[PDB]
Amino acid sequence: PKLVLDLERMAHVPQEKAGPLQRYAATIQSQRGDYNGKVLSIRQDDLRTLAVIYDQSPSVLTEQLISWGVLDA
Amino acid sequence: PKLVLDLERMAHVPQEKAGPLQRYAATIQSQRGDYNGKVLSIRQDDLRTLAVIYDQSPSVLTEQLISWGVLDADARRAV
Ligand SMILES: Nc1nc2c(ncn2[C@@H]2O[C@@H]3COP(=O)(O)O[C@H]4[C@@H](O)[C@H](n5cnc6c(=O)[nH]c(N)nc65)O[C@@H]4COP(=O)(O)O[C@H]3[C@H]2O)c(=O)[nH]1
Ligand SMILES: Nc1nc2c(ncn2[C@@H]2O[C@@H]3COP(=O)(O)O[C@H]4[C@@H](O)[C@H](n5cnc6c(=O)[nH]c(N)nc65)O[C@@H]4COP(=O)(O)O[C@H]3[C@H]2O)c(=O)[nH]1
Ligand SMILES: Nc1nc2c(ncn2[C@@H]2O[C@@H]3COP(=O)(O)O[C@H]4[C@@H](O)[C@H](n5cnc6c(=O)[nH]c(N)nc65)O[C@@H]4COP(=O)(O)O[C@H]3[C@H]2O)c(=O)[nH]1
Ligand SMILES: Nc1nc2c(ncn2[C@@H]2O[C@@H]3COP(=O)(O)O[C@H]4[C@@H](O)[C@H](n5cnc6c(=O)[nH]c(N)nc65)O[C@@H]4COP(=O)(O)O[C@H]3[C@H]2O)c(=O)[nH]1
């Protein structure tokens, strides 16, 4: 199920909560030279990486991304 | 050292030589829904995959793609 991230909502999620997601997204945009401001799709196994970054389980990370509306159900 | 395949050029290579590469590209394009039909950039690690499909070393495989005009000569530095 596509990990397609809304960078708009991402940009307005409280940092307190979303700073590591934003910095991860940013290193991918930089690697890619992909600077569109709207959407970032990322690899399925990048979910596992973000989960480590947040020290959460994938499933928890997922629910939290949905809740900020950065990912869709 | 980007691996960028030239699709127009690929389509001209005879199937008995380039067929496994053409099916690989079409499989990636399908997986992506990417039908620009001009260029296909692929992962560094996908060189390994094509080399396995061709039963060639990565060096041999890359030389072949350059000879077909499908990879620019850059790609040498990827192995
Ligand atoms: N997931 C995703 N990422 C996207 C999309 N559009 C653009 N990008 C990203 O944005 C970078 C720059 O895109 P571009 O310069 O406007 O424009 C491109 C594009 O015109 C062309 N290009 C190179 N390779 C490919 C390819 O495999 N497919 C397509 N459709 N275009 C490519 O070369 C430039 C740079 O390509 P890249 O190195 O791939 O780098 C791309 C890629 O990382 C998209 O629809 N989905
Ligand atoms: N810049 C960017 N746009 C994104 C991203 N995710 C989704 N999109 C948008 O959603 C469509 C499909 O993205 P996709 O699943 O990456 O699937 C894309 C992707 O696989 C590929 N693609 C398009 N442009 C590029 C490119 O510049 N470089 C590469 N490497 N692939 C590309 O073509 C497929 C279809 O592209 P489109 O339908 O025309 O247009 C896109 C694009 O408008 C993203 O991370 N970055
Ligand atoms: N080995 C290999 N497999 C490929 C390739 N292109 C597509 N696939 C497979 O096709 C899936 C969908 O690709 P996408 O629609 O462009 O959907 C892509 C896409 O938009 C984006 N994406 C992943 N990696 C890159 C990348 O290196 N550059 C760019 N610009 N976008 C990426 O995240 C998505 C989800 O990625 P995955 O979960 O890996 O999901 C990928 C992957 O399993 C390829 O060049 N090589
Ligand atoms: N549409 C589509 N294109 C794909 C996909 N996978 C690879 N590509 C294309 O192949 C190029 C090289 O992929 P790479 O060697 O994995 O080299 C990639 C890679 O190591 C890293 N990277 C980019 N996006 C992602 C991502 O979403 N996840 C991860 N884990 N790494 C990424 O940055 C490098 C440069 O990325 P780009 O300049 O976009 O350059 C990408 C791109 O144009 C895919 O799944 N979908």
Residue numbers in the entry:
A (entry chain B): 83 to 155
B (entry chain N): 83 to 161
What does the paper say about this structure?
Here, we report that c-di-GMP can assemble into a tetramer that mediates the effective dimerization of a transcription factor, BldD, which controls the progression of multicellular differentiation in sporulating actinomycete bacteria. BldD is an 18 kDa DNA-binding protein consisting of two distinct domains connected by a flexible linker. Specifically, structural and biochemical analyses show that the second messenger c-di-GMP activates BldD DNA binding by driving a unique form of dimerization that is mediated by a tetrameric form of c-di-GMP.
To elucidate the molecular basis for c-di-GMP recognition and binding by the BldD CTD and to gain insight into how this interaction may elicit developmental signaling, we determined structures of the S. venezuelae BldD CTD (residues 80–166) and S. coelicolor BldD CTD (residues 80–167) in complex with c-di-GMP. Three S. venezuelae BldD C-domain-(c-di-GMP) structures and one S. coelicolor BldD C-domain-(c-di-GMP) structure were determined to resolutions of 1.95 Å, 2.33 Å, 1.75 Å, and 2.25 Å, respectively (see Extended Experimental Procedures and Tables S1 and S2). The BldD CTD uses a previously unseen mode of c-di-GMP binding in which two noninteracting CTDs are glued together by a c-di-GMP tetramer composed of two interlocked c-di-GMP dimers. Indeed, the closest approach of any Cα atoms of the two tethered CTDs is ∼10 Å. The BldD CTD interacts with c-di-GMP using two contiguous surface motifs, herein called motif 1 and motif 2, which are located between the two β-α-α repeats. Motif 1 is composed of residues 114–116 (RGD) and motif 2 is composed of residues 125–128 (RQDD). Specifically, motif 2 from each CTD protomer combine to mediate contacts to one intercalated c-di-GMP dimer, Asp116 of motif 1 from each protomer combine to mediate contacts to the other c-di-GMP dimer, while Arg114 sits centrally and anchors both dimers. By sharp contrast, the BldD-bound tetrameric c-di-GMP is a tightly packed structure that is not secured by ions. Notably, the identical CTD dimer-(c-di-GMP) tetramer structure was seen in multiple crystal forms.
